[PDB]
Design a protein around this ligand. Structure first.
Ligand SMILES: COC(=O)c1cc(C)cc(O)c1C(=O)c1c(O)cccc1O
Ligand SMILES: COC(=O)c1cc(C)cc(O)c1C(=O)c1c(O)cccc1O
Lengths: 141, 141
């Protein structure tokens, strides 16, 4: 893996792109092959590609206003090129208040300047319920 | 923190005590003051003490047989004396088949030979619903 300080810069940039809550800012730290996978695996939530996330992030980030990110724990394994964040999120949506918590596992790419893989355990109801109703709304058009 | 090598060996022992699926073997690697906290915080599951766990462990390990533990991911931050494990579990119970997945955040003690704090995201229904109903049953007797 890349040196600890190179990975750590990428880890910090990843958090700030998330906290910034813009599509380009957040995705800037994804490698081109980076994927997101919802945990637990038993939930059967399909992985999201970088391109998937490019399409989804604008609408979700626009719907969730006053977004806040509270970093509770960061665990960085530089020898393995891996990290974990435990983060608590809040936002306002037109439907009412939004709250979530994410245990997000990260893998850095070999160079160390991007996140190459994400696996995360969080309340995925927006992903399981809103996403299909979003899809079927585009198809009905 | 303790030497990285010692922390890693304790993490290995912690995992093996769990996999061995005996109460004494699993709790051997908990410090005397170790606590467990269920995530997410939004669920408000009260922190469990070592004594709480000493009471809970014999009955769960008796009801779950053919216990399997699969370690999917280990992330070890030796400079911080912290680690995360992602683990998938399965077992048989008299009520039917059991499965779970745990994202477990661990802190080592200063000496490095015990885990002194646990915070874990997992399906907590067995500890939140089963054991209280067991305790009410005893109270009725
Ligand atoms: C647009 O949100 C992100 O960029 C995002 C970012 C991170 C680090 C994890 C996520 O899971 C998401 C996400 O996609 C998401 C979601 O899919 C549903 C609800 C809330 C979310 O944050
Ligand atoms: C019987 O305790 C353990 O071996 C145990 C071990 C670890 C590493 C995390 C846990 O959360 C538990 C647990 O307490 C538990 C539970 O409360 C309900 C279902 C399965 C479980 O493993």
């Amino acid at each position: 893996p890349a040196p600890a300080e190179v990975q750590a810069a990428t880890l910090e940039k990843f958090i700030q792109g998330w906290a910034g809550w813009t599509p380009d800012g957040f995705l800037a730290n994804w490698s081109e092959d980076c994927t997101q996978k919802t945990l637990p695996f038993s939930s059967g939530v399909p992985l999201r590609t970088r391109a998937d996330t490019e399409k989804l992030a604008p609408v979700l980030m626009s719907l969730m206003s006053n977004f806040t990110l509270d970093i509770h724990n960061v665990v960085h394994d530089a020898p393995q090129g891996k990290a974990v964040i435990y983060a608590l999120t809040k936002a306002d949506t037109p439907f009412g208040p939004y709250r979530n918590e994410h245990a997000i596992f990260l893998w850095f790419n070999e160079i160390g300047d991007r996140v190459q893989k994400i696996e995360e355990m969080f309340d995925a109801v927006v992903m399981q319920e809103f996403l299909p109703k979003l899809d079927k709304y585009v198809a009905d058009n």
